[PDB]
Amino acid sequence: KSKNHTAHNQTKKAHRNGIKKPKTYKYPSLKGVDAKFRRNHRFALHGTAKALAAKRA
């Protein structure tokens, strides 16, 4: 007796509000990245902080 499924006035609804791109940023989210790489990457950024501090003198 009842109607099952349809896709009428569905794409028409979506284009009213937007259909938008996902923004994008500089410095993306560093998640799901290799753990061995990240540990060494932390020590590199710690060491280079000492370098720039000594230069400004």
Q: What is the x/- site pattern for RNA, positions 8-47, by CB under 7 A?
A: xxxxxxxxxxxxxx-xxxxxxxxxx-xxxxxxxxxxxxxx
Q: Does 57 bind RNA (CB under 7 A)?
A: no
Question: 46 in the Ramachandran plot: left (φ > 0), alpha (ψ -120 to 50) or beta?
Answer: alpha
What is the nearest approach in angstroms of RNA to the Cβ of residue 57?
12
- Size of residue set near RNA by CB under 7 A: 51
> Which residues are CB-contacts of 30 (< 8 A; sequence separation ≥ 6)?
38
**Which two tokens mark 39?**
């540990």
Residues of this chain that interact with RNA (CB under 7 A) are 1-21, 23-32, 34-52, 55
